[PDB]
């Protein structure tokens, strides 16, 4: 949170920079303008973190609307005021934090709506800088440890020494995963202790098949399925032996929520 | 470039953060790997900015193929060594910058073969923190100072006669001022005030190119620039000789495509 805001100040940097001429003769005066939302059905989120920022911004707000809050209809959806050219600098920031977090949001609130035994969840591809707020819109969304990768498995020989190795150095709580891509890898990852299964990119009948095989030597390792299933597919791999899907279509889909800051006169 | 460096060691730590637990025990290892492309048809960037970021993070490296560069097939385009806790750390933030600017460069070249007349551009709707990236993705892709004023500036100055005034007040002789327009009435104003580019915005082929010409009309030392969420297929409704430059949303907007991997070689 200090760590976000700073982050969100230095994304202001980066569109100033050094300062920004247009607003720059409009210094000495104050202006309100409201924040509008513009796409229809759509859960909000990055509320508390786009308060936290115009205030650090020196901006006064108000919001109308809440964190993981479901959206009927456009409207206005907060509004700010405060020193004009501050207003002006902070606004492409601000619109981008506020774009980003809506659409995952609401993705992954799709997603879970169309699930009845696994839990939606997000992969490790997040866009670089920002996965950070992308992580706080899928818990807003509704979804909700240590990672054995391929290149790991080729230095460490098996899932066995990396399993053994990586123990060494967490507490007793902490799970680790590995990642496979067929049957055999999978129950060598069991046999080697992993705590949770990713299955990468399988069909939804291999799917079927493996966690079946899993879950029969060892029903407590927890299975992820991991790939780009779309909204329309996601059901496939909802059988009672997944306990988790995630989808990189959370993160990585175009942002499509629309939302600007038009100032009142 | 130091500017980049330090974002990209910024990325490194948001992926790391604190400590890469499944890698510690590897760190007194080295190892090399292959990057690897996935994806057919593609014009490669972020190869330069790439090598300074694995120098920077301390691994030795070899590029078989250069930013600007088309490519046909799939394949093997480089090579990268040195300690292992190091490699595996600096793989993810490796592969969102060349995913993400080869994406960029690749629909940017996609554009510019289809336009005679206007050149292509990035918008400033860019992703937050990659922007620098992106922009550089798009001059590899062929695409490619000024200050703009948009709507909000519009309203709190009264007019653009005044915002061009007031802003002409603080800037270099040789640097342009863009008035964002959304129609015929609010762009022969801009053109009266005096700006140097007038960004048409939100507006169908034919209103645009009834606006250009007027602007051209006017005066032909305006540039005219056409923005928006045009798309590839669309992009040539806009290009008229009265358009000097398009921008697209598409260009640093569209999901990221280009599949690239680092494997390690045993």
């Given at each position: 949170m200090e760590k976000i805001l700073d982050l969100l100040m230095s994304f202001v940097k980066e569109d100033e920079g050094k300062l920004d001429l247009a607003s720059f003769p409009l210094r000495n005066t104050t202006a309100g303008a409201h924040l509008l939302?513009?796409?229809?059905?759509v859960v909000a989120s990055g509320i508390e973190v786009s308060r936290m920022f115009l205030e650090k911004m020196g901006l006064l707000s108000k919001f109308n609307v809440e964190d993981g809050e479901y959206l009927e209809g456009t409207g206005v959806i907060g509004e700010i005021e405060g020193n004009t050219y501050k207003l002006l600098v902070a606004e492409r920031t601000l619109l981008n934090v506020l774009s980003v977090m809506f659409s995952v949001a609401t993705t992954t609130r799709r997603f879970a709506e169309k699930l009845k035994h696994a839990k939606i969840a997000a992969t490790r591809k997040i866009l670089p800088g920002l996965g950070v707020l992308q992580k706080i819109a899928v818990v807003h969304g509704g979804g909700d440890c240590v990672m054995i990768k391929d290149n790991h498995l080729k230095m460490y020989g098996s899932a066995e020494r990396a399993v053994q190795e990586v123990r060494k150095i967490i507490p007793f709580t902490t799970k680790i995963e590995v990642e496979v891509e067929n049957l055999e890898d999978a129950l060598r990852a069991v046999e080697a202790g992993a705590d949770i299964v990713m299955l990468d990119n399988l069909s939804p009948e291999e799917v079927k098949d493996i966690s079946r095989r899993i879950k029969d030597i060892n029903p407590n390792v927890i299975v992820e399925v991991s790939g780009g299933i779309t909204e329309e597919n996601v059901s496939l791999y909802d059988f009672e032996t997944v306990d988790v899907i995630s989808s990189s279509r959370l993160t990585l889909q175009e942002v499509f929520v629309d939302l600007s800051l038009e100032i009142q006169r």
């Open positions: 939302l513009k796409t229809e059905n």
